Symmetry: D2
Subunit: 237 residues, 4 copies
């Protein structure tokens, strides 16, 4: 029922629903079967960094995941989001575990949206940046198992007392304010987001990954979207 555009960091290859048989980043447009992907050397235990970028002039959504000192995977997909998203949306992060599991820690998150026309480069803008999460974060909507305060961190999926990931968990966090991503007079709309994540898995076969998603404002976790559906899509079509 929801419209979802997402960039997925996928740590487990469900080949039966279109996954490359490796860890990959991907671009999803309304479906979990990514429109485009790229091989990703998931570095268990290391803190990574994901940048998403988009602007309506170029009409190309791009993403990069990089680890401190070395690797970057990267992926882009030309798409015009005017005819996909609604002009008001909410922005968030999502992650799930299933049979196998991993921590899905978000250590920081920032987003910037601009609607520019001409009028001497005049704008509408939203910007937020958490470089630390409070135990009482009144400006995040937490959904599912998502919790905060865990060392100043956003724990998207459930973790037991000692610091071990639990299975079939699904959490999401959305910024509280609606976002006006597109508008018909805007000669250039654009956005870009970054978050630093730490994925850790003991059972060295992690699952399921994390996603940054833009949705219709009233989105909530579809029934039975733990594991391979990333808490985003209600089926795998």
């Amino acid at each position: 029922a929801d419209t979802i555009v997402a960039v997925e960091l996928d740590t487990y290859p469900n080949t039966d629903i279109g996954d490359p048989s490796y860890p990959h980043i991907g671009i999803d447009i309304k479906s979990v079967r990514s429109k485009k992907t790229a091989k990703w050397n998931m570095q268990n235990g290391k803190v990574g960094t994901a940048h998403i970028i988009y602007n309506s002039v170029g009409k190309r959504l791009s993403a990069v995941v990089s680890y401190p000192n070395g690797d970057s995977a990267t992926v882009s997909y030309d798409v015009d989001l005017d005819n996909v998203l609604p002009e008001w949306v909410r922005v968030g992060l999502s992650a799930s575990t299933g049979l196998y599991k991993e921590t899905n820690t978000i250590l920081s998150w920032s987003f910037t949206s601009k609607l520019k026309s001409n009028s001497t480069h005049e704008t509408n803008a939203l910007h937020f940046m958490f470089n630390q999460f409070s135990k009482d974060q009144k400006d995040l909507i937490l959904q599912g198992d998502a919790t905060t305060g865990t060392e100043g961190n956003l724990r998207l999926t459930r973790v037991s007392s000692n610091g071990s990931p639990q299975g079939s968990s699904v959490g999401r966090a959305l910024f509280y304010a609606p976002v006006h991503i597109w508008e018909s007079s805007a000669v250039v709309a654009s956005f870009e987001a970054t978050f630093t994540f730490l994925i850790k898995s003991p059972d060295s076969h992690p699952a399921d990954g994390i996603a940054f998603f833009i949705s219709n404002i009233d989105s909530s976790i579809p029934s039975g979207s733990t594991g391979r559906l990333l808490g985003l899509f209600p089926d795998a079509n």
Copy 2:
């Protein structure tokens, strides 16, 4: 019941409750009887501009109202907002009419909040800027008579069909997201806001003006705060 800190643009001198007998800007801390004011040459029909500024190192809240080509009135008040506001607040604009009346148009509005510690100048930030208001502004909470879309403008108080101000009107608009204005580890918290307003009055004796206010997150118009109480305070104590 609400905690309010506000900067008031007061167009009508209610001397019986502590007003200088002229148009003034003022700084209110929990009371409508301003802690500090300054004479203001209200320029009926002209578009003005107000800048509010604060930072917890200097502990001095300041405001300026200026009209295109010429006048600025200005006012500051040393106050430590740690021991006044709650650490989560909502930010908004407010305006009312009473026996006499004026249009209370807001043409644009922007706000920026930062919580900085050290860690190589690292931050938490919120920022929004409307340079035009939509007819369906999903990120403003409108209270009272406040409406949008009126030529891309925020009409804080009621105006009849032809463009004439109505009496005893009270509207408010608050940004949708809670704001974390203060936090105990922040070595410097700070904020600053600007809005451009157009006040017009036919009955050349305008009232009551406009205010930018920070409140507890769940604030709403106190009963019978039209006219001299600016839709902010429930009594005049």
Copy 3:
């Protein structure tokens, strides 16, 4: 001798050197014969607005020119600027007249450059914004006939006393500070610029237009690059 990447607003079609036989925007990479163009309805006398955007993940340089209420022309070109520009450059505007002429007024200009790695979305940044030009603008390098102060405006090419454009004129303006546009560790470098221009021509056959260009830091006007060479390139190859 110079390396130039530029986006040209071309008001006069020199078909003999590869121009579409109409007003066009274009993307130049080291040559005046654009790599890509788009038809442009030059609106003599109206103030227009140009946005340039680039980021090294998508590797696509895009531009839009829009006039207040209505038209936008737009153009993009996938190019990897790592292997074109030097990692330190200067940024500027350029414009020329020749046999025919036009005013080449810049009313405002802003630019933003970021070099991001990971390290929790940490950056290097430069940003400037002139919304008005001083008569003594110590942070612009003016070259050729370029002058400031003309009503708070940057007059790229020569204009006589009464406000009439002169022929075979060439001016350029560059921001004073070198800019570090690219660096080998940056997992995402990006920039974007906007300027509002007012072109006016009495002899209703205007020439030669305006360009935003990135060059090696020590660039200066090539000999005899008035008219169709926009003060950018020394020949038309």
Copy 4:
């Protein structure tokens, strides 16, 4: 000959020229004998963080030095910089050693200047942020012993091969572009800067500290301003 406004981090108490007999931060206006100071618990070996802030409405210059987990010293001084600085200035950092010595490492630096009038909150702005210094930093003017590239760090004063501070050293670094700090129409001018520093001293009696200074654009090290004069002032009057 130079006009200097500076905030000094002073690690060595020269009581004979007006120092409190302890490590202090201070505000200097044209003289090394600070207008105002505050006790500072210099934490040898730890990375500290300094925030300077100013805006022309409040007319109060403030500074904070804080160390990770714990201490902050703080100091403010009401001063109107319109009648002190020239409207074009350069901004920089400075540090010196003398008989005793310390490393004077700058690990990052950022600055933001705005000239706002009304016109719906419209601006002129400069902003730069180095979160790492290059070996070939084309946008810094280095003066005296100041060098870069030293682990991605700005080494304001001379350090020998193994990492030991040398005596009677004086370095300065200024951002390349002139800065327009004040202008007569600005209804609010404002600036703010941050840098992270690491001071280390083996001879546990460190000297002389570091300063952030605004000067006339053509400033250079006064003769014999090593040690207690911080490379800023030519005498101690």
